[PDB]
Amino acid sequence: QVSPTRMNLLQRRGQLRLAQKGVDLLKKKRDALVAEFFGLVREAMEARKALDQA
Amino acid sequence: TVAEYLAFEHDYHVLVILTDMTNYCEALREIGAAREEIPGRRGYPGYMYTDLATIYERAGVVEGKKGSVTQIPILSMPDDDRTHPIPDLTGYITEGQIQLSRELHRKGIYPPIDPLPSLS
Amino acid sequence: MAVIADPETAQGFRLAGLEGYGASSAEEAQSLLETLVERGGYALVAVDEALLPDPERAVERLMRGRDLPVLLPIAGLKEAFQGHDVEGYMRELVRKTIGFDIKL
């Protein structure tokens, strides 16, 4: 734990605020990786089909 | 009193071990709460800085004489912090502390002195 | 570059130059795959579709060393005269990825 004063209450509010921003930051990162995953999946099935024809 | 006598009138090299000053501050909290007196932090009175100062600052060496007083107070930090008024005001009067760590003693290290929160 | 695909049609892959092995038994093919991931056969192993759906799990068990030997499900020839089911293969790849039956 931490010995509670009025300083540590604001330090833990600051740590909570940083984690609440970090959750939304990593959700934006996951959205960019979803966009690139649906980018690559059609290229992978296209190359797979060309491999099938050859 | 005996430390100042044996160091500054008979030229010894007195080392004082002041065991567990948290009991002294508990006794001051008792006698300050029985007098209806202005608290400081966590119920300890106003003059606790002055009384811990007039215990601690009766040490050192003097000019032109031979003796020396070396004080090692021992502190039982209540919730092992540096925010309780007893280790806090103790660290304010004194010159440096040596702080023990609960992590290193669980790891089995003796003396478990972490050097980051300690200084001289 | 090595293959474990067919008993005889792996000779066409040898005729491409790239080396390989064929056993038509699953465990000796996987054992030559084991000495092929110990003695790394130049970073590519192409494994038959309708003999091993997932070749990679036993190989990452018996070698947690890195994925320099790449493992692909390469198509069997006979099923290649049917139809690849490209759609269903990408369905199972996406469900192996995130679990969801979501369809791109």
DSSP B19-69: --THHHHHHHHHHHHTTT--B-STT-BTTHHHHHHHHHTS-B--TTS---B
Which residues in A lie closer than 8 A to residue C87 (C-beta atoms)?
45
Between the alpha carbon of residue C78 and those of residues A50, A53, C57, the distances in Å are 17, 14, 25
Contacts of A3 in chain B (CB under 8 A): 79, 81, 83-84
- Give how far A37 is from chain C: nearest CA, Å: 10
How far the first Cα of chain A sits from its last, in Å, is 65
**Mutation test of the interface with chain B: which of A1, A2, A3, choosing the one with the most B Cβ atoms within 10 A?**
A3
Q: Does C104 touch chain A (CB under 8 A)?
A: yes
| Inter-chain CB proximity A5 and B83 less than 8 Å | yes
Mutation target vs A (from C72, C79, C86, C91; most A CBs, 10 A cutoff)? C86
Any long-range contacts for C62-71 (C-beta under 8 Å, 24+ apart)? C62/C34, C62/C37, C63/C37, C63/C38, C68/C40, C68/C43, C69/C36, C69/C37, C69/C40, C69/C41, C69/C43, C69/C44, C69/C45, C70/C43, C70/C44, C70/C45, C71/C45, C71/C47
Integer CA distances (angstroms), B120 to B6, B35, B36, in order = 25, 37, 38
Q: Is A42 at the interface with chain C, CB within 8 A?
A: yes
Chain C interface includes A10 (CB < 8 A): no
Structural contact between residues B64 and B55, judged by C-beta atoms closer than 8 angstroms: no
* CA-to-CA dists, residue C62 to B59, C20, C55, angstroms: 69, 20, 12
CB–CB contact C86 A52 (8 Å): yes
Method used to obtain the model: cryo-EM
Verify B-C touch: 3 or more CB pairs within 8 A. no
The CA distance from C42 to C45, in Å, is: 9
Q: Are C73 and C49 in contact (CB under 8 A)?
A: yes
Interchain pair A48, C104: CB under 8 A: no
